[PDB]
RNA sequence: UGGUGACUCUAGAUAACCUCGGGCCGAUCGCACGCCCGGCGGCGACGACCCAUUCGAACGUCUGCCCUAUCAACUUUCGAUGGUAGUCGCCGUGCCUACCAUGGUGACCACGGGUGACGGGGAAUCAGGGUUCGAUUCCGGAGAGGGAGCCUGAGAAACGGCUACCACAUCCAAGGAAGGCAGCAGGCGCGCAAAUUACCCACUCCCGACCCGGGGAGGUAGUGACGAAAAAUAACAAUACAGGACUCUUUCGAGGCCCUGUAAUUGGAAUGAGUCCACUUUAAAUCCUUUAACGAGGAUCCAUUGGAGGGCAAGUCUGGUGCCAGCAGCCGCGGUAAUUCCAGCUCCAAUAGCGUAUAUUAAAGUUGCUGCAGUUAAAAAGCUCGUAGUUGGAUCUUGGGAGCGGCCGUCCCCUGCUCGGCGCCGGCCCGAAGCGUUUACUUUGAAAAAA
RNA sequence: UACCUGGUUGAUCCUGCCAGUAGCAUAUGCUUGUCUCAAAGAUUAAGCCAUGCAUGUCUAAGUACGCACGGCCGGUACAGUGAAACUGCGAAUGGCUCAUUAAAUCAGUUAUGGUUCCUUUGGUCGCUCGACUUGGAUAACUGUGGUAAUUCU
């Protein structure tokens, strides 16, 4: 008897065939395009989509104007719309099945930090996130999984604290400026 | 530039205190010590710093903001009455015995071996 | 076990208290009292969890032992006292007075009242028996044994009793058309007029209850209280008025309030 | 009197009893003190017979459990099923006695045996069905080395109580005495297999005469790749180069305004692994978060684990061995050009993880209800009768009345006889009880711990 | 994601199994930078256990003649804090483990009009027609011990 949680679940599934050429080379096409680091980062997104895509199958069996469906369905639609994956024009849950992995990879912080143009590449973007240079509404985000809410997209900029902003200039410059005055004399 | 906005402000007449969640803005420099917040909250709410008890600070990641919980009592006679002993001891106005519970228990079990006034002659 | 249990596990605690599952192993086991374990709200949970005056349980000791908390008329220095349905919690130094009536969602609401209102409560009678020398006795839901009640008071009625004396004033007969707070099951907290009591001899008597919006439901009789004559209640009701607007209605009424208030 | 669906209920009346191992009816204690020609009282504490209430407990109802027939009859005058009257027990009961009756259960699997069987909430897997697991933090049960007996108490057949016996074992001046970690640590042993003889009552609650004491319950650290979540191991430019847009050239070549990729080429800008003042954290610390200062070019601050014949992603490369050594889940490789061994380079896969053995799930439509098969691949009894089991022909109400939308759609009606409200000169229309072929089925409702 | 793939043949189509394939939970091998949660002597032996700890407790309110400490105004005893000790209450909860147990346990579902119940809560507590407070102890304390030895007495 203890006051611990225990509740924890996996966020991915390993695929059945470990050596489908067609899969191996489509998941590396995803990793290159969007600058992820291993196939777990891809199977993580694919698994979230599969759970969404499982819940959608479950609600489409139900009769139209079912109270559980109308509540649960709109709740699922407003969530996908809120993260910028689905459209407000298209929020109808037969479109949720016509929805794929690139739509979720586009909304992760790494790709937004790149496609706003305050990073130079997708690999530079992770560097800028990992090295806590970027923020979202005065919150410095260390983590490139961070799925950007649709309203919360425009508030991605540099940290006030980082040298890319109006921040205290970094370790290499400050050591090279001190070595530069130690070099001049 | 260390600022304090208070929040969830409540006046407990039944513990004779104000209590509030303390949002401290400190961008650029570290978590500011409790003493400074206690002095900075005293001049805010027009009281002495001695009847204020401000604890349990968790600085948000990134670190331009932290949150602790605060209490302002009416008198030190109330403070010393209805405050937990460890949080008084942080203000250096309470001392507990140095003797660990291993000593107190070995004393207690030795004291059960003897009956009557001999129970006094266990610790020398 | 080889004798009565003195502990209660936090995960075993009744759901309506809304204790978490990470603060401790144990919940407060309610002190033996007028109300049942599964139906009472202990004083500690009404002080540190709901009103949030205290933080810890040692704080609730430092409030209740100062003899401030006056549950239905009498001061209580027991942190795990079972305060239950209709009981009036009078915190005197704040000048506040609370009646424990169920929110339309299962949990007990914090429902403030006027001190003029606090002077009386309303008690469901459990049974009537005739005492030692033809003396009619009268046991209520909070076990307030009353000797010499009005003879037209029957088994499932309610009685408006004055707390300062403990004597009946007026009684509501269990009749069709009378208001009903439902105090058990899925329909816990629901308010509505009693439509049809359906008698099942040997089994439990179900009782249909029509709502104020017309959303008629039913309950087992034992879970049904009466709070008013016809449509007019004898208490002040908590906001929502015991209707239970649906999850769809709750959602769009949260959306409406979230945008309109700002 | 009042009450139930039902009392031999509760209450009333009569007559008595009322245990000496004994029902109650207060010889109890605190604060504040008063009024009253010595008497009257406030606020509590504790106590107390009985009723009720809460907390339960106990014994009963209905239905539900794995394998086994190389377990087919079992139970019974040392109680088996029932009757009657007691005894015992908190009470209902073959619980137990006495006398009776001869029952009770079973092919709808009793009875016996087995179980690496505490049950359940649950766990894994998973198209739909399923299969496997559940010692394990919540519920309920059981036990404290094995049996047994009991004291106290509201509650125990208690074991951090006692009494024996059995087994084991401690101390002994040898007469005696003491023991029970399947509590927390820790030790031995057993094993493929599992952590510190740590700090603390601050949280959570519990116990007590109790705002105050105590709690290996619980919390906090330590060990911890059981497992889960996030997530570094570099990014960017200038150059050599190469591939792809264009004017242009048969080919070469020219330009790079545009791209894209690689070289221990060079260049600064980076940020945390670590180091570390301080605050914060906290019972006191730790970790995290915050934050001075240091902290990176072979960014040596150095990513492994397994593979590279097929299944199965990736060398017909080089050196060694020569059916040896070995690899090899299977098929196979090894006897002198080894794509498979032993290494080098190289490439692939997953990646802070990856391999192996074993149980188990899917794959297994290779246990088949969904859904398998049975001429010849394994398989239909030699043949027939035959009882339980399973399955079982057809048949028993329909037409229209009332209303709407543009001939077709969606609604209300096609049982009857004691008590009062929309009314009327004994009853007419209607409201509320109670009897109404009996079940499966379907739909709704109540009720159903959380996790 | 409701999936198959190699292997009997000279070659073929089958039945059919072996092997592969992914998860899971125990062990284990090699390797391991940061960070958040976190299982962890169940499996064999419900085997045996050195040592330390794990259940004690006081209010204004049962009992204070320990000067153990201490207030002064005493002769109408009793200031107060207060060890010990009697008393009361608890120790039947919690914790551990899963050996036994197969209509048992357990689960849902009812019954208790068949029972018991410290405690809390509310009743009840001049209902009986018949001393301005009583009696004997015992502990703590003091003293005398005995046993090699016990929380012995």
Is A132 part of the contact surface with chain B (CB cutoff 8 Å)? yes
Which residues in 59-98 of chain C line strand E, with CB less than 7 A from it?
74, 78, 81
SS3 C261: helix
Chain A touched by C253 (CB under 8 Å): no
Q: Are B18 and B47 in contact (CB under 8 A)?
A: no
Strand partners, A134: A158
Round to a whole number and report the distance in Å from the CA of C138 to the C1' of D10: 13
Chains with 3 or more CB pairs under 8 A to chain A? B, C
Cα separation, C140 vs C157, whole angstroms: 10
Separation in Å, CA C245 to CA A150, C72, C190, C250: 30, 31, 10, 6
Helix (H, G, I), strand (E, B) or coil at C146: strand
Chain A CB contacts of C246 below 8 Å: 67
- Give residue for tokens 């409540």: B10
Distance CA C38, CA C23 (A): 21
Tokens of A136: 């979202």
SS3 C197: strand
- Quick one: tokens of A19? 């050596």
What CA–CA distance (Å, rounded) separates C206 from C155?
Answer: 16
Nearest to C23 by CA among C53, C38, C44, C5: C44
CB contact under 8 A, B28 and A161: yes
The structure tokens listed for A151 are 């309203």
As a whole number of angstroms, the distance between CA C8 and CA B121 comes to 42
A18/A14 Cα distance (integer angstroms): 8
Spanning CA of C132 to C1' of D24, the rounded length in angstroms is 15
Asked if B54 and B70 touch (Cβ cutoff 8 Å), the reply is yes
Q: How far is A11 from A175, CA to CA, in rounded Å?
A: 43
Answer whether B69 touches C (CB < 8 Å). yes
**How big is the CA angle at C53 (ends C50 and C57), to the nearest 5 degrees?**
85
Q: Which three-class secondary structure state does DSSP give residue C44?
A: helix
Break positions in chain B: residue before each gap, C to N over 2.5 angstroms:
none
Give the CA angle between residues C187, C8, C12 to the nearest 5°: 45
For testing the chain B interface, which of C55, C67, C70, C95 should be mutated: the one with the most B CBs within 10 Å?
Answer: C55
Nucleotide nearest C221, from its CA to each C1': D446
> Is the Cβ pair B14, C56 closer than 8 Å?
no
Closest CA to B56 of B104, B103, B90: B90
C1’ E146 / CA B100, Å: 40
Nearest CA-CA partner of A112 in A146, A78, A160:
A146
Identify how the structure was determined. Answer: cryo-EM
Quote the CA–CA distance of C121 and C160 in Å, as a whole number: 6
What is the four-CA torsion angle of B23, B27, B29, B30, rounded to 10 degrees?
30
Q: Is A157 on the interface with B (CB under 8 A)?
A: no
CA–CA gap between residue A96 and residue A107 (Å, rounded): 16
- Are C64 and C43 a contacting pair, CB within 8 Å? yes
- The helix (H) or strand (E) run that includes residue C122 is strand C120-130
Query: 98-117 in B: which are within 8 Å (CB) of C?
Result: none
Distance CA(C181)–CA(C158), nearest Å, equals: 12
Q: Which of residues 32-51 of B touch strand E (CB under 7 A)?
A: none
Q: Which residues from the 25-64 window of protein chain C have CB within 7 angstroms of nucleic acid chain E?
A: 25, 31-34
DSSP assignment of C50-117, as one string?
Answer: II-S-SSHHHHHHHHTTT-EEETTEE---TT-EE-TT-EEEETTTTEEEE--B-SSSSBP-EE--HHH
What is the C-alpha separation between A90 and C26, in angstroms, rounded? Answer: 49
Q: At what angle do helices C247-261 and A67-82 cross, to 10 degrees?
A: 40
Three-class SS state of C24: coil
Residue reference for tokens 């049942």: C36
DSSP secondary structure letters along chain B = --EEEEEEEEEETTTTEEEEEEEEE-TTS----HHHHHHHHHHHHTS-GGGEEEEEEEEPTTSS-EEEEEEEES-HHHHHHSS-HHHHHTTT--------HHHHHHHHHHHTTS-GGGGGSS--
CB pairs under 8 A between B and C: 22
Instruction: Check CB contact under 8 Å for A67 and C248.
Output: yes
Q: How many CB atoms lie within 10 A of CB C223?
A: 18
Q: What is the CATH number of the domain that holds B81?
A: 3.30.70.3370
Given in angstroms, what resolution was this structure solved at? 3.1
Interface residues 34-63 of A with strand E (CB < 7 Å): 50
| CA A42/CA A28 separation, integer angstroms | 9
Q: Is C160 helix (H, G, I), strand (E, B) or coil?
A: strand
Q: Between the CA of C215 and the C1' of D426, what is the distance in angstroms? A: 45
Q: Do A3 and C248 touch (CB under 8 A)?
A: no
Is residue B13 within 8 Å of residue C93, measured between CB atoms? yes
| Distance in Å, residue C45 CA to nucleotide D64 C1' | 40
Task: Provide the 8-state DSSP code for C203.
Answer: S
Specify the residue for token string 């401290």: B24
What is the per-residue DSSP string for chain A? --S-------S----SSTT-HHHHHHHHHHHHHHT-SSTHHHHHHHHHHHHHHHHHHHHHHSPTT-HHHHHHHHHHHHHHHHTTSS-STT--TTTTTS--HHHHHTTBHHHHHHHTTSSSSHHHHHHHHHTT-EEESS-B---TT-BPPSTTSTTEEE-SSSTTTTPPP-HHHHHHHHHHHHHH-
CB C185 within 8 A of CB C220: yes
* C222 CB inside 7 Å of strand E: no
Within 8 A of A3 by CB-CB distance, chain C residues are: 10, 21-25
Task: List phi, psi (to 5°) of C218.
Answer: -140, 165
Nearest CA in chain C to A73: C248
Q: A11 CA to D357 C1', in Å? A: 29
Distance (Å, whole) CA C17 – CA C108: 8
DSSP state of C174: -
CA atoms of C172 and C159, how far apart (whole Å):
7
Provide the domain limits for residue B105: 1-124
Provide the 8-state DSSP code for C145. -
* Length of chain B as a residue count: 124
C-alpha B69 chain-centroid distance = 11
State the total domains in chain B. Answer: 1
How far is it, in rounded angstroms, from Cα C191 to Cα C178?
10
Backbone angles phi, psi at C148, to 5 degrees: 60, 65
Task: Give whole-number Cα distances, B20 to B43, C44, C50, in Å.
Answer: 16, 20, 16
The contacts found for A27-34 with CB under 8 angstroms, 24 or more apart, are: A30/A101, A30/A102, A30/A105, A33/A102, A33/A105, A33/A122, A34/A102, A34/A105, A34/A108, A34/A110, A34/A111, A34/A122
The torsion region of residue C125 among left (phi > 0), alpha (psi -120 to 50) and beta comes to: beta
Q: Are the beta carbons of B32 and B72 closer than 8 angstroms?
A: no
Among residues A24, A91, A17, A69, which one has the least CA distance to residue A99? A91
The nearest alpha carbon in chain B to C57 belongs to B84
CA distances for C46 relative to B13, B39, B112, angstroms: 17, 34, 42
The structural domains of chain C, ordered by start, are 1-116 (3.10.290.10), 121-171 (2.40.50.740), 174-244 (2.30.30.30)
Residue B46's φ and ψ, nearest 5 degrees, are 55, 55
Query: Does the CB of B55 fall within 7 Å of any strand D atom?
Result: yes
Joined together, the tokens standing for residue C72 give: 């239905």
Please report which helix (H) or strand (E) contains residue C167, including its range.
strand C167-172
CB B18 within 8 A of CB B76: no
Q: Residues C85, C183: contact at Cβ < 8 Å? A: yes
**What whole-number distance in Å separates Cα of residue C138 and Cα of residue C124?**
10
Which residues touch A51 (CB under 8 Å, ≥6 apart)?
Answer: none
Are the beta carbons of C159 and C186 closer than 8 angstroms? no
Angle at the Cα of A88 from the Cα atoms of A84 and A90, rounded to 5 degrees: 105
Per-residue b or e along A71-91, where b marks 16 or more CB atoms closer than 10 Å to that residue's CB: ebbeebbeebbebbbbeeeeb
């Amino acid at each position: 008897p203890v006051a611990r949680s225990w509740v924890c679940r996996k966020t991915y599934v390993t695929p059945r065939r470990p050596f489908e050429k067609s899969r191996l080379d489509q998941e590396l096409k995803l990793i290159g395009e969007y600058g992820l680091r291993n196939k777990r980062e891809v199977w993580r997104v694919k698994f979230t989509l599969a759970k969404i895509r499982k819940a959608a199958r479950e609600l489409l069996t139900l009769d139209e104007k079912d109270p559980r469906r109308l509540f649960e369905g709109n709740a699922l639609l407003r969530r996908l719309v809120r993260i910028g994956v689905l459209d407000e024009g298209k929020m109808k849950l037969d479109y949720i099945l016509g929805l794929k992995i690139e739509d979720f990879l586009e909304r992760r912080l790494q790709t937004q930090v790149f496609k706003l143009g305050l990073a130079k590449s997708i690999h530079h973007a992770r560097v800028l996130i990992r090295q806590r240079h970027i923020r979202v509404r005065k919150q410095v985000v260390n983590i490139p999984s961070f799925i950007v809410r649709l309203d919360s997209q425009k508030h991605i900029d540099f940290s006030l604290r980082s040298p890319y902003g109006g921040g205290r200039p970094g370790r290499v410059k400050r050591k090279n400026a001190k070595k530069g005055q130690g070099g001049a004399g | 530039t260390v600022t304090i906005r208070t929040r969830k402000f409540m006046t407990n007449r039944l513990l004779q205190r104000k209590q509030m969640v303390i949002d401290v803005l400190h961008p650029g420099k570290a978590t500011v010590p409790k003493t400074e917040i206690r002095e900075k909250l005293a001049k805010m709410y027009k009281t002495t710093p001695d009847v204020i008890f401000v604890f349990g600070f968790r600085t948000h990641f990134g670190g331009g903001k932290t949150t602790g919980f605060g209490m302002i009592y009416d008198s030190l006679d109330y403070a010393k009455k209805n405050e937990p002993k460890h949080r008084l001891a942080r203000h250096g106005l309470y001392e507990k015995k140095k003797t660990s519970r291993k000593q107190r228990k070995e004393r207690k079990n030795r004291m059960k071996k003897v009956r009557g006034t001999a129970k006094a002659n266990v610790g020398a | 076990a080889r004798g009565p249990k003195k502990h209660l596990k936090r995960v075993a605690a009744p759901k309506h208290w809304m204790l978490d599952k990470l603060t401790s192993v144990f919940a407060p086991r309610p002190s033996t009292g007028p109300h049942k374990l599964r139906e009472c709200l202990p004083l500690i949970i009404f002080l540190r969890n709901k009103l949030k005056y205290a933080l810890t349980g040692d704080e609730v000791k430092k409030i209740c032992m100062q003899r401030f908390i006056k549950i239905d008329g009498k001061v209580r220095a027991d942190i795990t006292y079972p305060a239950g349905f209709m009981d009036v919690i009078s915190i005197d130094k704040t000048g506040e007075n609370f009646r424990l009536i169920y929110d339309t969602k299962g949990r007990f609401a914090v429902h403030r009242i006027t001190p003029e209102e606090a002077k009386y409560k309303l008690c469901k009678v459990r049974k009537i028996f005739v005492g030692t020398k033809g003396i009619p006795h009268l046991v209520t839901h909070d076990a307030r044994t009353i000797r010499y009640p009005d003879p037209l008071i029957k088994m499932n009625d309610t009685i408006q009793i004055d707390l300062e004396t403990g004597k009946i004033t007026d009684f509501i007969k269990f009749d069709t058309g009378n208001l009903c707070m439902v105090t058990g099951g899925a329909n816990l907290g629901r308010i509505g007029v009693i439509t049809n009591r359906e008698r099942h001899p040997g089994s439990f008597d179900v009782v249909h209850v029509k709502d104020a919006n017309g959303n008629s439901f039913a309950t087992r009789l034992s879970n049904i209280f009466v709070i008013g004559k016809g449509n007019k209640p004898w208490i002040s009701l908590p906001r929502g008025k015991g209707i239970r607007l649906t999850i769809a209605e709750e959602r769009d009424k949260r959306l409406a309030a979230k945008q309109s208030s700002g």
